[PDB]
Structures are given as structure tokens and as C-alpha cells.
Amino acid sequence: MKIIALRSSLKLAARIAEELKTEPVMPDERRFPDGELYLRYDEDLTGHNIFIIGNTHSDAEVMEMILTLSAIQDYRTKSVNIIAPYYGYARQHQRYKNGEPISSQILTEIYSSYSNSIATVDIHDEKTLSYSKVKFSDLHANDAIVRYYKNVDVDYVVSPDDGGLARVADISAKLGKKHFFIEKKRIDDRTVEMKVPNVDVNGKKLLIVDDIISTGGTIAKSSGLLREKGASKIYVSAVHGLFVNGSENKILQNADEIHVTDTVESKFSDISVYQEVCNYIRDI
Amino acid sequence: MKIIALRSSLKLAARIAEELKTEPVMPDERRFPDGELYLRYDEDLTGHNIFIIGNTHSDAEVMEMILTLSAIQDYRTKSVNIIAPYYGYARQHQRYKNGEPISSQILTEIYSSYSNSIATVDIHDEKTLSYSKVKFSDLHANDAIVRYYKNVDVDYVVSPDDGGLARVADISAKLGKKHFFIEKKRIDDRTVEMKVPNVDVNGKKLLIVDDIISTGGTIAKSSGLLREKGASKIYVSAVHGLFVNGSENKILQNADEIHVTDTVESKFSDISVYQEVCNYIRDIDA
Ligand SMILES: Nc1ncnc2c1ncn2[C@@H]1O[C@H](COP(=O)(O)CP(=O)(O)OP(=O)(O)O)[C@@H](O)[C@H]1O
Ligand SMILES: Nc1ncnc2c1ncn2[C@@H]1O[C@H](COP(=O)(O)CP(=O)(O)OP(=O)(O)O)[C@@H](O)[C@H]1O
């Protein structure tokens, strides 16, 4: 097998390659003076199953993935398999107003045209998997998150909204903990929040889990609500830590700690999903 | 017909739309907090021939084109026709080393998959045309450049290297002028230049023409050479004025004026290709 490690995913891809006892093949990569992207893979990938590892979220990341898909065509490879730890544009998986792109659709179509398989970790909404002509697998960071928190004192696992439920139910089951979610709504400028079930959080230690942290607004608000109700400790976890200015400070206003995975590498990437990806590769 | 004017081509697209008595339809466009691109075309495009005008060279331009090609699928259109006044990645039209992308190939395949036709103005190397499943037309700024310089005192039209020869031959003939080209080559750290034919440029007014000005090294050097040999005026034109790294100033050290087209809009964009694109649009109909 050959593991290609793209710029966005050097850390995770390296962890993966080492575990698999194989080279993390990186491109030679630079920008031409006019700003166009240049890539080169001088290693002979002929006859190998190739696993390209890189996020598909920024303009640059998309260009890096597309041009990689072209570069590898120089070789008669056994198969080409895309693994995008964080899959970009998953949030635009339908048209929400007329004349909008279904961004995740056209992009998945493109990737699927040039590969034999696609996989990502905890895609936002699985609708997008249906846009691929090749098998598109949704991998899960659950076990890695459970591994981390087995050595932490936790009373409840909590979803910040009424949508992150399945993940929180699975994670809590594996930790042997109870769980609940927070339903937040705005009714005429004023905010209303319901705990379901209506758990007493007074003096309790809470692990809040979500899939993505962007602006952090969603998790920051719920953390503040729970702190207000007497939570003794709040841990914040997400799979994909984007942390756009200035999410970390909003969250840490009321939460004690932030721990995300290495799908998107940051100072808070304390939980690696390498094992989950290796399983997929081993079986693919 | 509906003309869609993308961010990179607002000036040219607007000129085209106005010439054709139609709206230059712009997207509502913005970046989400995480940096992902949002576009929206609220106009009803159903039943129309659509012409999407935008360059395809920057990362953002590529995303703009791709997401536009998805957004317009919300409507039952008659046809979708891409016009990229400047076509990105045309310079990488083969693998020059093992394991390089053929960037112009994969990108052309993508655009072709979501359109009924593609056009650009003066592609760098027509090899890339063959990468498209749909008809990929190479329009030319020649007549526009001619129309500008028929009112300029010019003695010779000149190619900066021995490759943009057909264009310079066509332009000089339409101006009723002679032409030559400069062969520059490096031989053991020294640079050797030959004029072909070996024209005496002393006291002569020269129009240098290329397809793209990027770093402008070749043109700046040639201008210096020609100036040293006694040229009285040097005009520099190119279809695509990218102007990276101070190139325009490097060139103006020895050239008198720079005039480029509006394929890439800058303060040097004095020659519009709107008529050439309108003629193409008229042919494809609507
Ligand atoms: N990268 C991004 N960042 C922020 N918002 C985005 C985004 N991409 C798309 N969006 C917007 O986010 C909104 C998502 O719609 P919502 O109704 O809030 C959730 P949904 O997509 O219906 O269900 P889901 O979140 O369970 O998949 C849309 O308006 C979409 O345009
Ligand atoms: N945007 C860009 N800017 C600068 N150089 C680029 C580029 N994209 C690709 N290149 C490089 O430019 C080189 C072009 O190859 P050359 O041998 O100089 C001319 P050619 O492409 O063979 O003929 P042509 O210029 O007549 O098309 C390649 O090494 C390619 O990798």
C-alpha cells in the first residue's frame, strides 16, 4: 500500500503510516509566481493501493486534492482511495434557497470520478454519501473519544442540540454513563433551553460532544447555560476543531477544557483517530 | 440568453452584457466563518442559454466556477456555456516530470462534465483544447489589439521569443507592418539574443506582443536589448496581464507603455475583447 499525506493532514497521516509501517508519501509542493499550485509525486506508485489523506475544506485543500488525483494518474495504480478526515462543504448538502449550489454534491461527484472509494470521519449529515458513485464510507471517532474519557471523571455526556444525539448515546453507552441533550430555541429575541431528559446538573461533571466547532457559538452558549445551573466541570469535545476567531475563548469562558481529534490539527488535538482510519484501510 | 458575471470578470462581463442588451447576472457571494464559499443566483434561469464568464486561475476563481456550475443545476436551462477569458493552468498541459499532474487536463475534464461548451481567449498552448469532451473554442484578441494600434505609430511588431509567432504575424499583417522575433538563450551563464530576421531597430518604433505577462522577465530583458540598440519607442502588449512581482515596473524601465486586455482587469487594461466574445456568444445562440 502507499499512503499519501497531503499538507492539511500531515500529523494524522504520519500517525497512520507509522502504525501501518509504511512511508507517508508527501508531495513536492509549491506555488508558481502567478499563484497556481504545483505538486509532484516522484515515487513510483505503480501497482499499489493508494490512500490519499487530506481535508477537503479550504480552497487550497480542494486544489491539492484535485491536482493529486491527476498526478497519480501518471501511474498504473491498483486502486485509488480518498480519505478526507474532515470533509468540506458537508454543511451545504442541499439547496436551502433557489439558485444555491449543492456544494457537497458536485464536489463528491468530482472526487468520485477519479477514485475507487471515498471515506471521511464523522461527515456532517450522511445525505452527502449518496452523491458518490463509488462507495463513500462514514468513519467514526467515537471509540477514540471513549478511550480518552475513560480516565476522566464524567457524570453525563451531553449533546449541545437535538441532532448530535446518536453519537452522544453511543459514547455514553461505551463510557457507562447517562446522557442528555439540550434543545435551544429563540422565541421572539429571547432564548429558551430545555434539557432532555430534564437532568439535574447541579454539581455534576459534564462532557459536551459535537461534530464540528467553527465559531463555537453553539457549544459556548450551552456550556454557559450548564455552568449557570451549577455544573461543577465542563469538558468540550468535537471531532473537527476548526476554531475560527475567536471560538476557543468564547468556549473557555464557561468550559474547563477542550479536546478535539487530529482530523483538523490544532493545539487542542488531544485525541487521535489514527486507529479508526487504519481499520478502514486494513479492511479496504 | 443569460450572462453570468463572476467576480474575476465583472468588467469584461458587464461590457459584453451591455453590448448584447442583457443583464450581467452577478451572484450573491460570501464566505462562511470557516472560509467555505457561498454563492446564490436567485434569478430564474429556466429555459435560457447560459453564459458563465469568469477566469479559472486562482484557487478562489476555480471554486467560484465549480460552485456556479452546481448552482445553475437548480434550473432547467437550454445550455450551459463556460467562457473563461483567462484559462488557468494552461501552462501545465502535460507532465514535465514523473508524478506531476496534467493540471489543465483534469480541470478541463471537470468543466466539460458540467457544461455544453467552453471558450477562452488566447489559451497558452492549444493542446489543452483536446482535453475537453465538449467543444473548446480558442478565441483571439488579435483584432482588438489591431484596432488599438492602428492609431499608433508602429514600425515593427515583435515576438519576445520564438513561440508566439503566428499571433505576431497575424497582427502585423492586419496593421500592414513587418515583424520579427527575438530568440533568447542562455549559454554557460551568458545570455545570447538573435533577432530573426536581423532587423535594424535603430530609430524604430516597436510593438512587442505576448500572450501572458506574469513575471515579465522575458519582455523586460528584450525591451532593454531593443532600447540599447536604439529603438525610439517600445510598446508592450499582452492578452493576459497577470503582473506578478513588480513585472510592470520592470518592463517600464525600458518600454514606454504597456497595454493589455480586460481578460484580466488591471489599470493597464486598455484593449477590450468584448466584441470578440460577443461574436462567439452570438454564434452559440440566444
Ligand atoms: N461551511 C458552512 N458554514 C456555516 N454554514 C453553512 C456552511 N455551509 C452551508 N451552510 C449553511 O448552513 C445551513 C444548514 O441548514 P440548517 O437548516 O441549519 C441544518 P440542516 O442542514 O437542515 O440539517 P443538518 O445540519 O442535520 O444536516 C444552510 O443555510 C447552509 O447554507
Ligand atoms: N502557472 C505557471 N507558471 C509558471 N510555470 C508553470 C506554470 N504551470 C506550469 N509551469 C511550468 O512551466 C513549464 C512549461 O514548460 P516549457 O518547456 O517551458 C514550454 P512548453 O509548455 O513545452 O511549450 P509551450 O510554452 O509552447 O506550451 C513546465 O515546467 C511547467 O511545469
XYZ file of C-alpha atoms and ligand atoms in Angstrom:
632
model
C 0.000 0.000 0.000
C 1.004 3.638 -0.364
C -0.176 6.390 1.973
C -0.128 9.900 0.504
C -0.014 12.605 3.151
C -1.313 15.980 1.986
C -0.455 19.294 3.657
C -3.634 19.590 5.752
C -3.244 16.102 7.212
C 0.474 15.576 7.840
C 0.005 14.737 11.534
C -2.800 12.190 11.240
C -1.365 10.726 8.033
C 2.028 10.264 9.688
C 0.433 8.587 12.706
C -1.442 6.309 10.325
C 1.558 5.437 8.177
C 3.732 4.606 11.183
C 1.054 2.319 12.602
C 0.888 0.610 9.208
C 4.683 0.510 8.972
C 4.753 2.380 5.656
C 6.008 5.660 4.203
C 3.842 8.778 4.498
C 4.429 9.916 0.913
C 4.359 13.709 0.762
C 4.343 15.716 -2.442
C 6.889 18.262 -3.508
C 4.587 21.267 -3.442
C 4.923 24.939 -4.211
C 3.114 27.878 -5.748
C 4.214 29.282 -9.088
C 4.860 33.028 -9.128
C 1.341 33.547 -10.538
C -0.198 31.697 -7.597
C -1.036 28.418 -9.327
C -0.442 25.201 -7.375
C 2.313 22.750 -8.293
C 2.592 19.173 -6.991
C 4.815 16.210 -7.716
C 4.970 12.592 -6.511
C 8.271 11.185 -7.785
C 7.869 7.826 -6.024
C 6.684 5.046 -8.338
C 3.144 4.254 -7.187
C 2.654 1.643 -9.918
C 0.721 -1.436 -8.798
C -0.072 -0.203 -5.284
C -3.333 0.522 -3.494
C -3.124 4.247 -2.856
C -4.657 6.066 0.075
C -4.746 9.843 -0.277
C -5.153 11.549 3.089
C -6.170 15.207 3.167
C -9.007 17.517 4.187
C -11.307 18.998 1.508
C -12.384 22.199 3.228
C -10.270 25.212 2.125
C -9.834 26.390 -1.488
C -6.203 25.281 -1.235
C -7.152 21.874 0.164
C -9.553 21.267 -2.718
C -6.888 22.206 -5.270
C -4.354 19.957 -3.513
C -6.762 17.013 -3.662
C -7.811 17.561 -7.289
C -4.249 18.005 -8.567
C -3.114 14.974 -6.563
C -5.831 12.931 -8.287
C -4.342 13.976 -11.615
C -0.710 13.497 -10.606
C -1.209 9.886 -9.512
C -2.676 9.041 -12.923
C 0.916 9.016 -14.144
C 1.000 5.568 -12.543
C -0.810 2.314 -13.272
C -2.051 2.000 -9.694
C -4.043 -0.891 -8.216
C -6.656 1.401 -6.698
C -7.067 4.997 -5.576
C -8.797 5.609 -2.271
C -9.597 9.041 -0.900
C -9.625 9.537 2.863
C -10.604 13.086 3.855
C -10.541 13.224 7.669
C -12.589 16.418 7.603
C -14.861 16.593 4.579
C -15.510 20.166 3.497
C -18.845 21.527 2.270
C -20.787 18.796 4.104
C -22.926 21.590 5.542
C -24.154 22.546 2.051
C -25.680 19.159 1.207
C -28.840 20.533 -0.385
C -30.231 23.784 -1.748
C -31.646 25.931 1.065
C -32.769 28.637 -1.353
C -33.249 28.609 -5.118
C -30.065 29.037 -7.125
C -27.759 27.766 -4.404
C -25.142 25.126 -5.208
C -25.402 21.694 -3.658
C -21.706 22.098 -2.984
C -21.189 18.685 -1.374
C -22.840 17.106 -4.414
C -20.691 18.462 -7.234
C -17.500 18.071 -5.179
C -18.301 14.482 -4.216
C -19.121 13.765 -7.861
C -15.708 15.132 -8.832
C -13.789 13.144 -6.216
C -15.774 10.014 -7.057
C -14.949 10.343 -10.751
C -11.237 9.999 -10.008
C -11.203 7.382 -7.260
C -12.359 3.870 -6.360
C -13.553 4.820 -2.885
C -14.012 7.768 -0.546
C -14.062 7.916 3.247
C -14.265 10.629 5.895
C -14.538 10.803 9.687
C -17.930 11.875 11.025
C -19.329 13.672 7.993
C -21.879 16.355 8.773
C -25.098 14.679 7.598
C -24.841 11.411 5.678
C -27.001 12.681 2.805
C -23.727 13.556 1.068
C -22.608 9.924 0.981
C -25.367 9.348 -1.572
C -23.780 11.794 -4.035
C -20.820 9.475 -4.671
C -20.802 6.900 -7.474
C -18.164 4.910 -5.572
C -18.575 3.604 -2.016
C -18.356 6.552 0.395
C -17.748 5.408 3.986
C -18.530 7.386 7.148
C -15.944 6.517 9.808
C -16.448 7.370 13.486
C -14.275 8.988 16.160
C -16.465 7.569 18.965
C -14.093 4.864 20.203
C -11.158 7.261 20.261
C -13.205 9.721 22.301
C -14.266 6.902 24.645
C -10.630 5.847 25.050
C -9.702 9.372 26.125
C -12.528 9.924 28.594
C -12.334 6.522 30.304
C -9.744 8.144 32.570
C -11.772 11.277 33.278
C -14.438 11.814 35.946
C -17.685 12.268 33.987
C -21.311 12.241 35.154
C -23.204 12.917 31.926
C -22.391 13.025 28.234
C -24.335 15.860 26.602
C -25.320 16.895 23.093
C -25.497 20.698 22.565
C -28.522 20.283 20.287
C -31.204 17.736 19.405
C -29.147 16.447 16.471
C -25.844 15.158 17.858
C -27.825 12.502 19.700
C -26.740 9.160 18.236
C -23.054 9.959 18.772
C -23.644 11.034 22.373
C -25.772 7.945 23.060
C -23.050 5.643 21.730
C -20.234 7.440 23.518
C -22.129 7.449 26.821
C -23.036 3.764 26.474
C -19.370 2.892 25.960
C -18.410 5.032 28.965
C -21.205 3.554 31.075
C -22.683 6.999 31.652
C -26.091 8.637 31.409
C -26.689 11.268 28.739
C -28.993 14.074 27.694
C -29.247 16.791 25.078
C -30.016 20.496 25.102
C -32.781 21.850 22.930
C -32.189 25.554 22.361
C -34.659 27.803 20.542
C -35.222 31.530 20.130
C -38.744 32.779 20.640
C -39.070 36.499 19.943
C -35.471 37.578 20.592
C -35.360 35.684 23.896
C -33.671 32.305 24.280
C -35.323 29.189 25.677
C -33.488 25.980 26.569
C -34.766 22.547 27.591
C -32.725 19.655 28.961
C -33.996 16.287 27.769
C -34.426 14.398 29.849
C -34.517 17.233 32.393
C -31.400 16.134 34.292
C -30.236 17.984 37.412
C -26.754 19.257 36.538
C -26.116 20.900 39.927
C -22.615 19.833 40.991
C -22.270 17.447 38.069
C -19.375 16.929 35.651
C -20.412 17.137 32.021
C -18.825 16.059 28.752
C -20.347 18.006 25.848
C -19.746 16.465 22.419
C -20.415 17.910 18.944
C -19.170 17.094 15.456
C -17.684 20.427 14.407
C -16.543 23.535 16.245
C -16.455 26.550 13.956
C -17.352 29.832 15.693
C -18.056 27.887 18.885
C -21.286 29.814 19.409
C -23.370 26.663 19.817
C -21.162 24.952 22.387
C -20.258 28.185 24.181
C -23.910 29.042 24.812
C -24.838 25.586 26.104
C -21.719 25.497 28.300
C -22.757 28.827 29.802
C -26.276 27.546 30.444
C -24.938 24.464 32.223
C -22.362 26.405 34.230
C -25.213 28.718 35.261
C -27.223 25.718 36.506
C -24.349 24.615 38.731
C -22.291 22.218 36.629
C -19.050 21.559 38.528
C -16.944 20.760 35.465
C -17.478 21.024 31.714
C -15.342 19.235 29.122
C -15.883 20.231 25.496
C -15.107 17.793 22.693
C -15.703 17.826 18.942
C -14.371 15.682 16.125
C -13.396 18.584 13.868
C -11.845 21.621 15.558
C -11.903 24.498 13.060
C -11.816 27.220 15.734
C -12.476 30.372 13.719
C -11.693 33.610 15.606
C -12.260 33.578 18.398
C -14.051 30.351 19.242
C -11.639 28.992 21.838
C -12.015 31.988 24.148
C -15.807 32.004 23.867
C -15.881 28.319 24.800
C -13.326 28.524 27.616
C -15.372 31.315 29.192
C -17.514 28.620 30.786
C -15.926 25.292 29.884
C -12.842 23.959 31.681
C -11.186 22.061 28.839
C -11.331 21.500 25.092
C -10.282 18.207 23.492
C -10.707 17.537 19.766
C -9.239 14.981 17.358
C -6.459 15.261 14.789
C -8.775 15.358 11.758
C -8.074 19.080 11.898
C -4.757 19.627 13.640
C -4.633 22.270 16.372
C -3.320 22.873 19.890
C -6.463 21.113 21.153
C -5.957 17.924 19.095
C -5.526 15.558 22.064
C -7.442 12.635 20.597
C -6.157 10.819 17.530
C -8.358 8.895 15.141
C -5.460 7.049 13.535
C -6.687 3.673 14.773
C -10.116 4.167 13.235
C -8.587 5.048 9.868
C -6.162 2.125 9.981
C -9.117 -0.226 10.467
C -10.760 1.132 7.351
C -7.554 0.827 5.342
C -6.881 -2.667 6.665
C -10.364 -3.699 5.514
C -10.343 -1.668 2.268
C -29.736 34.420 -23.099
C -28.450 34.880 -19.560
C -24.940 36.181 -18.910
C -23.472 35.321 -15.526
C -20.678 37.658 -14.459
C -18.330 36.091 -11.910
C -16.186 38.144 -9.522
C -12.999 37.930 -11.591
C -14.620 39.145 -14.823
C -17.053 41.861 -13.733
C -15.632 44.464 -16.145
C -15.468 42.332 -19.273
C -18.744 40.525 -18.479
C -20.501 43.855 -17.974
C -19.214 45.205 -21.284
C -20.359 42.028 -23.041
C -23.778 42.048 -21.392
C -24.299 45.723 -22.264
C -23.320 45.160 -25.889
C -25.852 42.311 -26.017
C -28.615 44.274 -24.255
C -28.856 41.875 -21.329
C -28.333 41.730 -17.565
C -24.895 40.900 -16.243
C -26.188 38.477 -13.600
C -23.922 38.516 -10.560
C -24.107 36.002 -7.754
C -24.775 36.874 -4.180
C -21.449 35.668 -2.810
C -19.774 35.458 0.578
C -17.515 33.363 2.776
C -18.868 31.385 5.715
C -16.991 31.908 9.018
C -14.964 28.735 8.342
C -13.861 30.091 4.960
C -16.101 27.958 2.739
C -17.619 29.653 -0.310
C -21.292 30.512 -0.619
C -22.956 31.512 -3.909
C -26.552 32.113 -4.916
C -28.278 33.004 -8.177
C -31.869 33.937 -7.354
C -32.796 34.845 -10.953
C -34.906 32.305 -12.853
C -32.554 30.850 -15.459
C -35.015 28.234 -16.710
C -35.180 27.783 -20.482
C -32.265 30.102 -21.247
C -28.866 29.638 -22.826
C -26.486 30.464 -20.010
C -23.056 32.027 -20.436
C -20.831 31.918 -17.357
C -17.968 34.410 -17.581
C -15.092 34.085 -15.141
C -11.386 33.303 -15.046
C -10.111 29.954 -13.799
C -6.647 30.587 -12.413
C -6.801 31.425 -8.670
C -7.991 28.866 -6.091
C -10.976 31.113 -5.373
C -11.792 31.501 -9.084
C -11.857 27.726 -9.534
C -14.192 27.344 -6.529
C -16.360 30.141 -7.923
C -16.645 28.383 -11.296
C -17.291 24.926 -9.824
C -19.946 26.084 -7.347
C -21.581 28.159 -10.066
C -21.772 25.038 -12.228
C -23.663 23.388 -9.347
C -25.908 26.351 -8.549
C -27.223 26.608 -12.107
C -28.384 22.993 -11.973
C -31.296 24.298 -9.898
C -32.771 25.459 -13.210
C -33.818 23.663 -16.391
C -31.500 25.545 -18.747
C -31.237 25.201 -22.534
C -27.449 25.090 -22.422
C -24.540 25.900 -20.143
C -21.586 27.623 -21.771
C -18.379 28.448 -19.932
C -16.316 31.426 -21.045
C -13.068 31.780 -19.085
C -11.443 34.893 -20.560
C -8.196 33.738 -18.921
C -7.853 29.962 -18.578
C -5.822 28.906 -15.543
C -3.356 26.000 -15.573
C -2.901 26.086 -19.361
C 0.835 26.193 -18.676
C 0.706 22.767 -17.061
C -0.713 20.916 -20.059
C 1.493 17.828 -19.847
C 3.619 16.049 -17.259
C 7.124 17.537 -17.435
C 8.387 15.141 -14.760
C 7.078 11.810 -13.459
C 4.257 12.226 -10.961
C 3.215 15.741 -11.948
C -0.445 16.497 -12.573
C -1.645 17.423 -16.017
C -3.492 20.223 -14.285
C -5.146 21.579 -17.449
C -6.410 18.080 -18.250
C -8.251 17.263 -15.017
C -9.627 20.803 -14.673
C -10.855 20.840 -18.280
C -12.470 17.425 -17.769
C -14.348 18.842 -14.786
C -15.596 21.949 -16.583
C -16.549 19.886 -19.632
C -18.577 17.495 -17.458
C -20.857 20.297 -16.291
C -21.166 22.389 -19.451
C -22.219 22.170 -23.094
C -19.256 24.230 -24.289
C -16.113 26.026 -23.138
C -14.312 29.042 -24.571
C -11.313 31.122 -23.558
C -9.299 33.973 -25.098
C -5.817 33.030 -26.339
C -5.123 29.873 -24.394
C -1.488 29.180 -23.676
C -0.985 26.186 -25.963
C -3.998 24.694 -27.723
C -3.066 21.190 -26.529
C -5.482 21.719 -23.648
C -8.402 22.105 -26.046
C -8.111 18.366 -26.734
C -8.764 17.557 -23.061
C -12.382 18.729 -23.299
C -15.310 16.440 -24.161
C -17.354 19.436 -25.284
C -16.272 21.938 -27.947
C -13.488 24.109 -26.520
C -13.065 27.257 -28.588
C -9.922 29.391 -28.555
C -10.934 32.999 -29.225
C -8.339 35.602 -30.212
C -7.640 39.156 -29.103
C -5.790 39.868 -32.362
C -8.400 42.152 -33.939
C -8.871 44.098 -30.717
C -5.126 44.674 -30.454
C -5.063 45.707 -34.108
C -7.931 48.157 -33.554
C -5.965 49.819 -30.771
C -2.636 50.074 -32.605
C -3.927 51.164 -35.994
C -3.883 54.568 -34.290
C -0.317 54.194 -33.053
C 2.875 54.898 -34.986
C 4.416 51.424 -35.246
C 7.273 50.163 -37.439
C 7.602 46.510 -36.415
C 5.554 44.064 -34.406
C 7.783 41.788 -32.353
C 7.569 38.481 -30.562
C 9.702 38.303 -27.362
C 10.567 34.662 -28.067
C 10.369 32.237 -30.972
C 6.987 30.827 -29.921
C 4.250 33.472 -30.186
C 4.997 33.828 -33.889
C 1.617 33.154 -35.531
C -0.060 35.830 -33.418
C 2.583 38.427 -34.257
C 2.436 37.506 -37.947
C -1.335 37.942 -37.910
C -1.279 41.231 -36.019
C 1.466 42.819 -38.136
C -0.279 41.842 -41.374
C -3.526 43.429 -40.175
C -1.559 46.553 -39.252
C 0.258 46.464 -42.606
C 3.602 46.186 -40.810
C 6.660 43.947 -40.878
C 7.623 41.798 -37.907
C 10.424 39.841 -36.319
C 11.059 37.765 -33.240
C 13.771 37.588 -30.616
C 15.449 34.304 -29.777
C 16.933 34.489 -26.292
C 19.018 31.657 -24.946
C 21.493 31.139 -22.156
C 24.819 29.518 -22.965
C 27.050 28.946 -19.944
C 25.757 31.799 -17.773
C 25.886 34.315 -20.635
C 22.707 35.304 -22.476
C 22.708 35.372 -26.274
C 19.932 37.040 -28.270
C 19.230 36.903 -32.005
C 16.728 38.989 -33.945
C 15.020 36.975 -36.696
C 15.262 38.322 -39.268
C 18.098 40.563 -38.098
C 16.132 43.800 -38.224
C 17.870 47.116 -37.637
C 15.754 48.682 -34.878
C 17.722 51.930 -34.695
C 15.220 54.806 -34.617
C 12.316 52.384 -34.986
C 9.034 52.060 -33.068
C 8.352 48.528 -31.909
C 5.237 46.760 -30.644
C 6.119 43.741 -28.534
C 3.260 41.231 -28.173
C 2.935 38.168 -25.935
C 0.055 36.060 -24.660
C 0.760 36.392 -20.947
C 2.718 38.807 -18.819
C 3.401 37.137 -15.498
C 6.836 37.894 -14.042
C 7.633 39.840 -17.203
C 11.276 38.754 -17.247
C 11.463 37.866 -20.934
C 9.788 41.066 -22.103
C 11.707 43.327 -19.721
C 15.019 41.909 -20.941
C 14.084 42.116 -24.616
C 12.872 45.697 -24.153
C 16.249 46.543 -22.637
C 18.056 44.914 -25.546
C 15.935 46.740 -28.108
C 16.316 50.042 -26.268
C 20.109 49.605 -26.185
C 20.092 49.023 -29.941
C 18.380 52.375 -30.489
C 14.630 51.714 -30.667
C 12.840 55.064 -30.413
C 9.615 53.768 -28.886
C 8.663 50.430 -27.329
C 5.050 49.443 -26.709
C 4.319 46.242 -24.832
C 1.045 44.394 -25.172
C -0.219 41.066 -23.985
C -3.637 39.444 -23.834
C -3.419 38.424 -20.165
C -1.850 40.934 -17.770
C -1.221 38.996 -14.544
C 1.627 41.296 -13.457
C 3.279 39.430 -10.596
C 6.237 40.634 -8.508
C 6.636 44.158 -9.914
C 6.701 42.943 -13.524
C 5.017 46.054 -14.948
C 7.649 48.292 -13.369
C 10.468 46.025 -14.541
C 9.102 46.286 -18.071
C 8.570 50.043 -17.885
C 12.260 50.505 -17.064
C 12.817 50.162 -20.808
C 9.410 50.130 -22.510
C 7.341 53.297 -22.920
C 3.827 51.943 -22.420
C 2.010 48.744 -21.533
C -1.464 47.958 -22.889
C -3.220 44.673 -22.165
C -6.795 43.412 -22.495
C -9.585 43.088 -19.976
C -9.377 39.288 -19.727
C -7.541 40.069 -16.511
C -8.609 43.508 -15.328
C -5.927 45.957 -14.210
C -5.132 49.628 -14.725
C -3.330 48.543 -17.911
C -6.459 47.002 -19.449
C -6.869 49.454 -22.375
C -7.936 46.961 -25.032
C -11.305 45.249 -24.560
C -12.088 41.849 -26.049
C -15.831 42.318 -25.548
C -16.609 42.283 -29.277
C -14.718 39.031 -29.875
C -16.601 37.316 -27.042
C -19.946 38.758 -28.169
C -19.354 37.335 -31.648
C -18.739 33.921 -30.127
C -21.838 34.198 -27.924
C -23.955 35.179 -30.948
C -22.764 32.062 -32.800
C -23.690 29.693 -29.953
C -27.043 31.488 -29.983
C -29.566 33.162 -27.647
N -19.412 25.891 5.818
C -20.564 26.378 6.332
N -20.577 27.079 7.489
C -21.714 27.563 8.014
N -22.922 27.401 7.439
C -23.040 26.718 6.276
C -21.847 26.152 5.645
N -22.251 25.535 4.521
C -23.601 25.688 4.442
N -24.058 26.390 5.495
C -25.454 26.774 5.771
O -25.907 26.123 6.962
C -27.318 25.915 6.839
C -27.655 24.487 7.261
O -29.068 24.405 7.370
P -29.780 24.013 8.759
O -31.260 24.010 8.456
O -29.278 24.970 9.817
C -29.295 22.352 9.283
P -29.660 21.074 8.049
O -28.539 21.072 7.030
O -31.075 21.260 7.538
O -29.598 19.677 8.871
P -28.215 19.005 9.364
O -27.438 20.145 9.991
O -28.676 17.981 10.387
O -27.575 18.395 8.139
C -27.721 26.260 5.408
O -28.308 27.564 5.363
C -26.397 26.325 4.670
O -26.417 27.266 3.587
N 1.394 28.797 -13.692
C 2.664 28.515 -14.065
N 3.636 29.460 -14.019
C 4.909 29.197 -14.386
N 5.310 27.997 -14.838
C 4.425 26.964 -14.927
C 3.024 27.169 -14.554
N 2.383 25.997 -14.744
C 3.305 25.118 -15.212
N 4.512 25.700 -15.325
C 5.769 25.071 -15.782
O 6.239 25.729 -16.959
C 6.920 24.775 -17.770
C 6.465 24.888 -19.221
O 7.320 24.045 -19.979
P 8.269 24.666 -21.127
O 9.156 23.533 -21.595
O 8.944 25.896 -20.568
C 7.287 25.285 -22.512
P 6.093 24.077 -23.140
O 4.945 24.030 -22.162
O 6.801 22.795 -23.510
O 5.580 24.736 -24.526
P 4.547 25.970 -24.616
O 5.075 27.033 -23.675
O 4.660 26.391 -26.059
O 3.192 25.413 -24.249
C 6.694 23.402 -17.153
O 7.872 23.057 -16.430
C 5.589 23.610 -16.150
O 5.743 22.743 -15.015
